[PDB]
Design an enzyme around this catalytic site. Structure first.
Site, PDB file in Angstrom:
ATOM      1  N   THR A 155       0.832  -1.193   0.000  1.00  0.00           N
ATOM      2  CA  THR A 155       0.000   0.000   0.000  1.00  0.00           C
ATOM      3  C   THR A 155       0.866   1.242   0.000  1.00  0.00           C
ATOM      4  O   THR A 155       1.718   1.401   0.865  1.00  0.00           O
ATOM      5  CB  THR A 155      -0.925   0.035   1.218  1.00  0.00           C
ATOM      6  OG1 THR A 155      -1.756  -1.130   1.218  1.00  0.00           O
ATOM      7  CG2 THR A 155      -1.801   1.272   1.182  1.00  0.00           C
ATOM      8  N   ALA A 164      -8.904  -1.569   4.878  1.00  0.00           N
ATOM      9  CA  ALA A 164      -9.613  -1.194   3.664  1.00  0.00           C
ATOM     10  C   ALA A 164     -11.100  -1.028   3.912  1.00  0.00           C
ATOM     11  O   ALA A 164     -11.742  -0.184   3.282  1.00  0.00           O
ATOM     12  CB  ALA A 164      -9.377  -2.235   2.574  1.00  0.00           C
TER      13      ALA A 164
END
Lengths: 250, 238, 213, 201, 199, 204, 232, 239, 228
Positions: free
Chosen positions: D1, D49
């Site tokens: 990420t 997420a």
């Protein structure tokens, strides 16, 4: 259940509301208290009502209640409703002191109580308090102060006010004899015995019929002194000595 | 009259008037007729409007796949019980995984509506539910009332001018337990033409028909698909 | 002590087409080293255009299925229409998050038709995050099935390979071949293959047997 | 990420990768980590997420109610302050959230950074993620306030490319937005394997 | 973890802090501000963990501003500092205690300048100089070496200069810049943002 | 431990018609002083004091809740509080936090207001009052203070020799402690006046 | 169930709380009772006539102790008295569990009267119909207090409540002074209850309790016949 | 809990307790407020003080924030508790959305605090009306009023209290564009209106202006004597 | 003398629900027309004073981007129902990621409209019109203080209701256009209002299938007035 309700909260069709005006009608009778200040010090002169010959005369006062370490109040009206208000703002001043570690200013103690008193006139379906009361005190922001409360819940600062049975007779004479900032705490004592000489129908001013307490500022003391019944009557006759001279010479 | 203010107060004759005044509210709504065969349950309603441009107020509601109701009274109280009605059907379907029986549903309604008829400052529910459904025992026609007293029946009619509809059903109920869905419906449509003034009857925009059926899920027909049912009726004899 | 979770196995698979959607799963319920039953599919028909698959803890898969089916009926009685495929996926993302601090141990894939008659596959985590994809696999053998569809459906890592869209005939034999490979290497892969096909007509079903180790 | 955002003369540039993993297994390659709150606000996805997806959808609900009552759009300072207060009520319960809030405002560009722990800071450049420290090195070299538009596109695009090259949990494609006066505009979406042949020669 | 200082004079209070907003190993922001006004003569300097420094210290700020609107005049620095101590100590034995270390600085028209010291356990201390952070171990010994109760504000700044040069000699963190305030009879005044050029 | 987080020492000693109380001045966090003027002895009316030692939060917290309940007592009643009555008041205040206890140990010293008779007592952190006739101690350096007072206390002592005994008891016991020191303040009260002295101790 | 939550005691247009005025009329129709303090202790005396010979007079008691040193009589209606006795029994205990000291007699009247004021304002209740006389010897000096259904209280030297109380107070004014013993106060308290009693005043028609510095106690009917002897 | 409907409908479609409370507004002292382009002007009339007593505790022009002034009429007991509930919300707005409170936001809070308060159980409605005067961001002077039923409503000039419709009829025949030309010119527009009201002979008037950057600034009875001199002298030369 | 708030008539309806129907005959008149091209929707303002700012009041307010409203009767308690409708459309968007239809907005408000009592205090004295374009085309609904809503084609609500409803049944047909439905409504408002019609006494708002909720202002509005 709605047949027995008395609706102590609604308006009247003329705009005003009846329930506190009946209480401010009851505040007219039953008591006499007055205050005055112009310089260092402020006094409360109250007139005793029950003067029966079988009483103990204890609890340090009758209508004077020490609220904080440096302010006190005189009360008038329903005495049973008076005791609940007194020990209600007595711990408002302490929870202020618990929170800030500083004595409370005298004005925002009055506004705190007069919000509690206002709420019963506004919701709850509840009888209001038939109590009006004075406030003397000292603080570092404005010095000696003098306040008056009402059962409606609105207050005001003053210099001289009575809530007696002939309070309107007294106020009309207070604004005939005064001076802004020059009445020291001997002329104010001399003027206090002159006013309640008039508004008390019981003549000759028996020294046990009145109560006088003063609040003078000593450096870290703010001495609240309920003056005893040995120096009242010399102040009574001091009014009586000059009035025979002032009448005969005129 | 001082005995006529609250639901709690009994009359000296023994008739609580606030319950009896809620019976007047169901007599103000428009009529509706329910009836059943051996294997089917048909309820037929009659809509109203205010102006000719506003739409017609619907009355037949879908509760479950095998339960439908028809209302008469003030509609805001009807939705207050209908949302209770839907809720009690799907949680029993959530717990037991089965359709809730019709006769056991209405006993929940009679306990629900009896409570405000005994407290203080609580109105009765002014509503006129006709209930049609399926148990395992075939069709059922039920009616309720604001007095919380539900009735098992085989043909009823409630609403404004409903007494003329009951007189038609009493002299034809020997035929109801035999016929199929085609003339079962137009038996009930001949009841609604009885409860009308003598000039207008059934112009395909004020009538609604609901059927629950032995292999048929509960289905509401509105103003276009009514036209196959509504044709084939004779003229009003005069 | 009392552990509130257990793994019951299972494997689901979806492929979105041009005018169809295929949802397939095995039929084995098993935990530990034993077998409960050889017949327990995961093809659940929500509407006639939507099929969901639920793998993971079976006590949550039974509960979550019955919560969803209650909420489609609450939709229709308040809106007079049925939920679309994209509306179910947004609703279930808030259902799964609503037990954030005691989550469902459920993997979910929703496959069905959108408003334009095209395929749509949504894939969830146990918390309620999602995205729309062309194909997803989920369950125990998901790590075996995902690289193979990347080659065939995704046309990845191939040079001079044409790009023909997925016919229904090619996609049926592609699903039937990829569960045979997963039955050989995974121990949780079942015995019968329940394939459900969502087209413009309706939901078809098909059962293909597997080996029974 | 790996996400980054920096503001300059001509608005704000937002960029992110698209790989979402699960342990060592890669779940997907096409995760859109820059979600679209409004036609005038943008938010990123960093950490959990599902937690970034929920609370920023819940923020978009709240900003719409503000606009109907007050008849103008919310400021960027007010929008991050709402998000910082909602998350604080669940402090210690284990929320993972490291998003950023972007958008044009009446005071110009806006770029704030909101944590799940309660951090709410302003700034000019930010980089959040597991491979965020790889993004800071290349971004600090080519950053200027007076960059051109096509030059600032190349800076943020190559900065993601260096982070995906070193980090194992970063990869996929490079999404790229641009916040302007009237609103945000989607710029492009390049694959890293296409950028590898581009940036080599 | 990060640093601030509390030199107090005869008719002034000299406060200063760093400007660094940290992260895992990187620094996110180099011009952060730890300084919170409540009144025209009262500051607040809060140090602690991530969420509690911002939200507790502005919770105090909305109550001090509210006291002035309800009454017309401001709190003293003594009552303001003694109101904050009540709010930690009540919230200490609770499910969500605040973990912040702070020191408050104020001037009053009656008793002059004042400085108070607190920690994450809510203990007050009227101190002539104080410091938080790990740099307080380095820098308190310079400060009581050279402190005079009758110190002028011109040489108090160069005392602060000496106290910060040693912090960039034997301290492992970076800390390049320092923002400086001064409080007197005329209120808050910004001084020069003193720093050390790392180029 | 928790009591050793800030240190502290409070001693009270009974004389002939007088009573003295003493405490240290250090405020610190586990190794490190902060200031040397931390108040630990608080006035509760004339001729009646209280000393607090333990955790520095609960020293400042209990001394404000106790003052809160004391002013309401002396306004509802028309008199000052007896020394014995305050001991029951504090023991109520600590026992309410039976499972959330304040980490402090109070020491009360004062004269009875009508008949001027001394009074000393001490309480644990949940309020077990213990009245004695010679001395009470509280703080971290308790065992050092027992060796002083068991060897130096005399039964009938004028306020001059009472001051010299409680000074030598504090200056030697606190000097042997590590987390207590930095000055000693001594109050000695009596029916006519009251006397506060600060001793020349080791700032080491 | 629930309550009413509205005050049924309102202000008249003449400014008088009417229900409190009517509650005092129930106090005036009660049994007569006198109470005198004299320089070492307080004497409470009441007047207890059974309606017939069938009643057991040694079953209930008018004079009640509150603690070791505080007694209490009334003049009003019966069942309202037993409520605020049990309330006053408990209020002396919460004072003792805090301060480890017997409650002063002034502080008890602070808290009993605050009940009755709270009870004449709240919703859906009528006020009490009793007045009280409270005695006790706290810190040497004795005390004598009197409450009312409104909630006020006073500090009397000697008073009388019940029937013919306006004749009792004139009788005490011509008899009481500052200097009497306890047993002299007993003889003048039976002499004032004889002003309104029936023909025969035996050892069970009255009930007398006293305070000393030794504490409150109630007289047994043996020595009550001795005080009733050599009377009038 | 006192649960009872107080304000109910009438047989013709009115609310009795609402229309009764508007009469109690109509017997308070008259407050007049106008607005200009850069400076706003408002000032109560009928001070009516005892003129030997205190006057800093009788004020009826207060401040909700730095940018919002507020005058009122009606009974003052219900009035100042509305102010203290408005001083909290305008401070909690700052802990949220960072700007100072716009004057349109704070009037919706007072009106919504008053509408739900004629809707609740066991509560008589408020007996006050207010004028909320302020200068928001971007420097736009505007004002509002508040009915006791809770209908906030903007204006360019207004006057409430006892003797309001007489003044409100006088304001429309007097408010021109050129009367808002100068700052001191707009002040005499108020002083002419209050002198056309209950007595207001310079000793019972108390005006207060705000020049969009300051706090509220009350002029002492020296400009009120000076303005009433030059306004009456301008009338003594024209007539 | 005093009934409760929850008492049936002997004729059977209620008292205060029927009283609230009388209260909406005092508000300003409002006209909405459903046309297959779109929904036009107008109102008057009833300006009292020349010193009054005209744009501060409003009757048209929007609920969402595709749903407008129009209120009559009392105004101060209409703002409660508008705020409940705004929150309801956002909760539907939050959980279902779509736009709530015009009908299901109305029953979410109508379930709130009859909930007064003496537990947990009077009905709402407003009357509303709901113009919107959902997926079934343009819609027009009208609720009640009684909680009854029904789809109308051309509804006139206010003090001049029955005078306008007579003149509105004669001009409407099912094949109108939006450009002439706007012109048809202003002729009706010109007859029923007190003052002369200008660009300040009234305001309009239309919703189309293509664009979102649009409200006219004082520049594009007076071309219809001068070309009436």
């Amino acid at each position: 259940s709605r047949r027995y309700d008395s609706r102590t909260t609604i308006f009247s069709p003329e705009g005003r509301l009846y329930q506190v005006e009946y209480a401010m009608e009851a505040i007219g009778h039953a008591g006499t208290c007055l205050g005055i200040l112009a310089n260092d010090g402020v006094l409360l002169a109250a007139e005793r009502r029950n003067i029966h010959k079988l009483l103990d005369e204890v609890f340090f006062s009758e209508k004077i209640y020490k609220l904080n370490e440096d302010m006190a109040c005189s009360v008038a009206g329903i005495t049973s409703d008076a005791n609940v208000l007194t020990n209600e703002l007595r711990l408002i001043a302490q929870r202020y002191l618990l929170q800030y570690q500083e004595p409370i200013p005298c004005e925002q103690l009055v506004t705190a109580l007069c919000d509690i008193k206002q709420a019963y006139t506004q919701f709850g379906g509840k009888r209001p308090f038939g109590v009006s009361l004075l406030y003397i005190g000292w603080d570092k922001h404005y010095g000696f102060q003098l306040y008056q409360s009402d059962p409606s819940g609105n207050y005001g600062g003053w210099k001289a006010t009575c809530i007696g049975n002939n309070s309107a007779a007294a106020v009309s004479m207070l604004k005939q004899d005064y001076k802004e900032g020059e009445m020291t705490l001997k002329s104010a004592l001399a003027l206090a015995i002159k006013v309640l000489n008039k508004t008390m129908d019981v003549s000759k001013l028996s020294a046990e019929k009145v109560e006088i307490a003063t609040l003078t500022r000593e450096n870290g003391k703010t001495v609240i002194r309920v003056l005893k019944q040995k120096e009242v009557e010399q102040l009574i006759k001091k009014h009586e000595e000059e009035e025979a001279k002032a009448e005969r010479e005129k | 009259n001082q005995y006529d203010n609250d639901v709690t107060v009994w009359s000296p004759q023994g008739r609580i008037h606030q319950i009896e005044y809620a019976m007047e509210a169901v007599k103000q709504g428009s009529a509706t007729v329910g009836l059943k065969s051996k294997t089917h349950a048909v309820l037929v309603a009659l809509k109203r409007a205010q102006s000719e441009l506003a739409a017609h107020q619907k009355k037949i509601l879908h509760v479950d796949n095998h339960i439908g109701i028809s209302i008469a009274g003030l509609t805001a109280d009807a939705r207050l019980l209908c949302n209770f009605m839907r809720q009690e059907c799907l949680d029993s379907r959530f717990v037991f995984d089965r359709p809730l029986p019709v006769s056991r549903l209405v006993s929940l309604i009679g306990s629900k509506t009896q409570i405000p008829t005994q407290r203080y400052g609580r109105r009765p529910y002014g509503v006129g539910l006709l209930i049609a459904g399926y148990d395992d025992m075939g069709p059922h026609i039920f009616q309720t009332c604001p007095s919380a007293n539900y009735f098992d029946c085989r043909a009823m009619s409630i609403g404004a001018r409903s007494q003329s509809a009951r007189t038609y059903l009493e002299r034809h109920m020997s035929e109801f337990m035999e016929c199929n869905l085609n003339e079962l419906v137009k038996h009930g449509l001949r009841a609604l033409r009885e409860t009308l003034p003598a000039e207008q009857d059934l112009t395909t925009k004020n009538v609604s028909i609901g059927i629950v059926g032995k292999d048929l899920e509960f289905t509401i027909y509105d103003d276009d698909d009514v036209s196959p049912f509504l044709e084939g009726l004779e003229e009003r004899p005069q | 002590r009392f552990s509130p979770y257990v793994f019951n196995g299972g494997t689901i698979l979806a492929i979105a087409g041009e005018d169809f959607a295929i949802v397939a799963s095995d039929t084995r319920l098993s935990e530990g080293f034993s077998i409960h039953t050889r017949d327990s599919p995961k093809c659940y028909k929500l509407t006639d255009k939507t099929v969901i698959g639920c793998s993971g803890f079976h006590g949550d898969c039974l509960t979550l299925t019955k919560i969803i089916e209650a909420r489609l009926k609450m939709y229709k009685h308040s809106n007079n229409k049925a939920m679309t495929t994209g509306a179910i996926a947004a609703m279930l993302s808030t259902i799964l998050y609503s037990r954030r601090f005691f989550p469902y141990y459920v993997y979910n894939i929703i496959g069905g038709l959108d408003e334009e008659g095209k395929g749509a596959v949504y894939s969830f985590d146990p918390v309620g995050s999602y995205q729309r994809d062309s194909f997803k696999a989920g369950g125990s053998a998901s790590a075996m099935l995902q690289p193979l569809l990347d080659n065939q459906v995704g046309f990845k890592n191939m040079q001079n390979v044409e790009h023909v869209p997925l016919s229904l005939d090619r996609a049926m034999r592609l699903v039937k071949d990829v569960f045979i490979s997963a039955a050989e290497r995974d121990v949780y892969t079942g015995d019968a293959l329940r394939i459900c096909i969502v087209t413009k007509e309706g939901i078809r079903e098909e059962t293909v047997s597997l080996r029974k180790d | 990420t790996t996400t980054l955002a920096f503001k300059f003369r001509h608005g704000v540039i937002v960029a992110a990768d698209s790989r979402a993993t699960a342990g060592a297994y890669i779940a997907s390659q096409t995760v859109k980590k820059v979600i679209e709150i409004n036609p005038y606000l943008l938010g990123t996805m960093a950490g959990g997420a599902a937690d970034c997806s929920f609370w920023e959808r819940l923020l978009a609900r709240q900003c719409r109610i503000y606009e109907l009552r007050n008849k103008e759009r919310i400021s960027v300072a007010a929008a991050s302050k709402l998000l910082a207060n909602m998350v604080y009520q669940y402090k210690g319960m284990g929320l993972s959230m490291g998003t950023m809030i972007c958008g044009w405002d009446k005071r110009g560009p806006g770029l704030y950074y909101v944590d799940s722990e309660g951090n709410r800071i302003s700034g000019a450049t930010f980089s959040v993620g597991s491979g965020s420290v790889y993004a800071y090195g290349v971004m600090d070299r080519g950053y200027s306030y007076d960059l051109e538009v096509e030059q600032a596109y190349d800076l943020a695009r190559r900065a993601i490319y260096q982070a995906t090259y070193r980090d194992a949990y970063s990869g996929g494609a490079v999404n790229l937005y641009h916040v302007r006066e009237d609103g945000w505009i989607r710029v492009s979406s390049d694959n890293v394997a296409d950028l590898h042949e581009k940036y080599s020669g | 973890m990060e640093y601030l200082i509390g030199i107090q004079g005869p008719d002034y209070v000299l406060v200063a802090s760093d400007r660094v907003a940290a992260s895992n190993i990187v620094q996110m922001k180099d011009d952060h501000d730890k300084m919170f006004k409540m009144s025209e003569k009262i500051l607040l300097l809060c140090v602690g963990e991530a969420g509690d420094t911002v939200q507790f210290a502005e919770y105090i700020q909305k109550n001090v501003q509210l006291y002035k609107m309800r009454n017309g005049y401001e709190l003293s620095p003594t009552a303001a500092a003694n109101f904050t101590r009540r709010n930690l100590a009540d919230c200490l034995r609770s499910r969500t205690p605040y973990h912040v270390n702070l020191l408050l600085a104020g001037y009053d028209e009656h008793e002059g300048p004042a400085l108070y010291y607190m920690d994450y356990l809510a203990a007050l201390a009227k101190a002539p100089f104080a410091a938080h952070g790990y740099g307080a171990f380095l820098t308190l010994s310079i400060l009581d070496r050279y402190y005079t109760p009758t110190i002028s504000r011109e040489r108090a700044v160069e005392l602060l200069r000496k106290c910060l040069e040693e912090l960039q000699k034997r301290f492992i963190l970076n800390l390049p810049t320092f923002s400086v305030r001064i409080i007197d009879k005329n209120g808050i005044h910004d001084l020069d943002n003193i720093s050390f050029p790392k180029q | 431990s928790i009591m050793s987080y800030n240190g502290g020492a409070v001693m009270a000693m009974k004389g002939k018609n007088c009573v003295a109380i003493a405490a240290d001045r250090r405020f610190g966090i586990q190794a490190q002083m902060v200031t040397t003027d931390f108040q630990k002895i608080f006035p509760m009316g004339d001729r009646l004091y209280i000393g607090l030692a333990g955790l520095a939060t609960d020293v400042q917290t209990v001394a404000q809740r106790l003052k809160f309940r004391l002013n309401l007592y002396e306004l509802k009643e028309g008199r000052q509080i007896k020394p014995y009555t305050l001991m029951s008041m504090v023991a109520n205040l600590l026992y309410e936090k039976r499972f959330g206890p304040y980490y402090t140990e109070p020491v009360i010293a004062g004269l009875d207001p009508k008949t001027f008779k001394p009074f000393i007592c001490s309480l644990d952190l949940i309020g077990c009052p213990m009245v004695t006739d010679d001395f009470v101690v509280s703080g971290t350096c308790a065992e050092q203070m027992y060796g002083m007072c068991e060897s130096l206390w005399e039964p009938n002592m004028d306020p001059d020799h009472l001051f010299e005994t409680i000074s030598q008891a504090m200056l030697n016991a606190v000097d042997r402690d590590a987390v207590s020191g930095m000055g000693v303040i001594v109050h000695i009260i009596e029916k006519d006046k009251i006397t506060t002295r600060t001793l020349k101790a080791r700032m080491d | 169930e629930r309550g009413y939550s509205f005050s049924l005691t309102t202000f008249s247009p003449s400014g008088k709380l009417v229900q409190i005025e009517y509650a005092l009329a129930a106090v005036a129709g009660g049994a007569p009772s006198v109470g005198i303090k004299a320089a070492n202790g307080v004497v409470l005396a009441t007047e207890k006539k059974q309606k017939s010979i069938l009643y057991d007079e040694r079953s209930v008691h008018k004079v009640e102790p509150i603690t070791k040193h505080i007694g209490l009589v009334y003049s009003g209606m019966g069942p309202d008295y037993r409520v605020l006795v049990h309330r006053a029994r408990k209020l002396a205990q919460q004072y003792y569990l805090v301060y480890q000291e017997p409650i002063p007699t002034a502080q008890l009247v602070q808290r009993v009267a605050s009940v009755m004021q709270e009870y004449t304002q709240s919703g859906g209740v009528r006020p009490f119909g009793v007045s009280l006389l409270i005695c006790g010897w706290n810190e040497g000096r004795p005390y004598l207090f009197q409450s009312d259904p409104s909630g006020a209280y006073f500090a009397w030297k000697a008073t009388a409540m019940g029937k013919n109380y306006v004749n009792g107070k004139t009788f005490l004014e011509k008899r009481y002074n500052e200097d009497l013993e306890l047993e002299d106060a007993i003889h003048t308290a039976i002499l004032t209850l004889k002003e309104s009693f029936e023909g025969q005043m035996t050892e069970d028609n009255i009930e007398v309790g006293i305070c000393n510095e030794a504490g409150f106690r109630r007289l047994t009917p043996t020595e009550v016949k001795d005080y009733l002897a050599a009377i009038a | 809990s006192y649960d009872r409907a107080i304000t109910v409908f009438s047989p013709d479609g009115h609310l009795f307790q609402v229309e009764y409370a508007q009469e109690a507004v109509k017997k308070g002292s008259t407050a007049v407020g106008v607005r200009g382009r850069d400076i706003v002007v408002l000032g109560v009339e009928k001070k009516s003080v005892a003129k030997l007593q205190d006057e800093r505790t009788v004020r009826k022009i207060c401040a909700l924030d730095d940018n919002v002034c507020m005058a009122f009429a009606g009974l003052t007991a219900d009035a100042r508790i509305v102010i203290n509930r408005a001083r909290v919300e305008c401070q909690s707005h700052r802990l949220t959305v960072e700007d100072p409170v716009t004057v349109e936001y704070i009037t919706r809070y007072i009106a919504s605090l008053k509408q739900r308060y004629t809707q609740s159980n066991g509560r008589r409605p408020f007996g006050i009306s207010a004028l909320i005067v302020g200068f928001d961001f971007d420097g736009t002077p505007r004002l509002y009023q508040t009915d006791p039923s809770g209908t906030y409503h903007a204006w360019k000039a207004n006057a409430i209290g006892r003797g309001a419709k007489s003044v409100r009829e006088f304001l429309e025949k007097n408010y021109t564009d050129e009367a808002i030309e100068t700052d001191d010119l707009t002040i005499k527009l108020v002083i002419k209106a209050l002198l056309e009201v209950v007595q207001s002979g310079g000793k019972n008037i108390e005006l207060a202006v705000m020049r969009r950057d300051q706090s509220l600034k009350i002029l002492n009875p020296e400009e009120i004597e000076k303005y009433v001199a030059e306004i009456e002298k301008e009338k003594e030369e024209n007539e | 003398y005093d009934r409760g708030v929850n008492t049936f008539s002997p004729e059977g309806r209620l008292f205060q629900v029927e009283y609230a129907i009388e209260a909406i005959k005092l508000g300003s008149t409002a006209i909405g027309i459903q046309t297959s091209e779109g929904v036009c929707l107008a109102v008057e303002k009833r300006i009292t004073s020349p010193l009054m700012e005209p744009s501060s009041i409003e009757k048209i307010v929007e609920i969402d981007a595709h749903i407008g409203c129009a209120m009559s009767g009392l105004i101060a308690d209409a703002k409660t129902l508008i705020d409940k409708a705004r929150v309801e459309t956002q909760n539907h968007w939050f959980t279902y990621n779509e736009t709530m239809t015009v009908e299901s907005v109305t029953q979410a408000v109508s379930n709130l409209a009859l909930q007064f009592g003496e537990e947990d205090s009077r009905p709402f004295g407003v009357a509303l019109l709901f113009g919107g374009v959902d997926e079934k085309g343009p819609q027009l609904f009208h609720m009640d203080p009684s909680g009854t809503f029904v789809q109308c084609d051309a509804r006139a609500i206010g003090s001049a209701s029955e005078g306008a409803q007579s003149s509105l049944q004669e001009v409407y047909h099912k094949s109108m256009t939006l450009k002439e439905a706007i012109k048809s409504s202003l002729i009706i408002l010109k007859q029923v209002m007190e003052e002369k019609l200008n660009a300040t006494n009234i305001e309009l708002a239309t919703v189309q299938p293509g664009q979102n909720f649009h409200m006219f202002t004082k520049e594009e509005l007076e071309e219809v007035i001068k070309d009436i």
